[PDB]
Structure formats: structure tokens, C-alpha cells
């Protein structure tokens, strides 16, 4: 998958 951390504000950054 991809583009999941975008909803949070990181786009695609490490887990937490
Ligand atoms: C506190 C808090 O929310 N913490 C947290 C935990 C996990 C993530 C997270 C989620 C996804 C994607 N999902 C895709 C479906 O199966 C599970 C993972 C990611 C996908 C790609 C990348 C990269 N490079 C990082 C990701 N990071 C971001 C933040």
C-alpha cells in the first residue's frame, strides 16, 4: 500500500 500517513500529516513516515 501507500499514502496512509498523509491523513495524519506525514504522508509516508516511519511507524509512529
Ligand atoms: C501513533 C500512530 O498513528 N503511529 C503510526 C503507526 C503506523 C503508521 C503507518 C501506517 C502505514 C500503512 N498501513 C497500511 C495497511 O496495513 C497496515 C499499515 C504506513 C505505510 C507506509 C509507511 C512507509 N514508508 C509507513 C506507514 N506508517 C503511522 C503512524
Swiss-Prot record:
Induction: Induced in T cells by antigen stimulation and by the S100B ligand. Induced in trophoblasts by DNA damage. Endothelial cells. Increased expression in pre-term labor and preeclampsia placentas compared to controls. Constitutive homodimer; disulfide-linked. Forms homooligomers. Interacts with S100A1 and APP. Interacts with S100B, S100A12 and S100A14. Interacts with TIRAP. Interacts with HMGB1. Interacts with LGP2; this interaction plays an important role in AGER-mediated pro-inflammatory responses and cytokine release. Interacts with double-strand break repair protein MRE11 which is a core component of the MRN complex. The interaction enhances MRE11 endonuclease activity and promotes DNA repair. The gene is AGER. This is Advanced glycosylation end product-specific receptor. The lineage of its organism: Eukaryota, Metazoa, Chordata, Craniata, Vertebrata. Phosphorylated on its cytoplasmic domain by PKCzeta/PRKCZ upon ligand binding. Phosphorylated by ATM following DNA damage. Cell surface pattern recognition receptor that senses endogenous stress signals with a broad ligand repertoire including advanced glycation end products, S100 proteins, high-mobility group box 1 protein/HMGB1, amyloid beta/APP oligomers, nucleic acids, histones, phospholipids and glycosaminoglycans. Advanced glycosylation end products are nonenzymatically glycosylated proteins which accumulate in vascular tissue in aging and at an accelerated rate in diabetes. It is found in: Cell membrane; Cell projection, Phagocytic cup; Early endosome; Nucleus.
Amino acid at each position: 500500500m501507500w499514502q496512509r500517513r498523509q491523513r495524519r500529516g506525514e504522508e509516508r513516515k516511519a511507524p509512529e
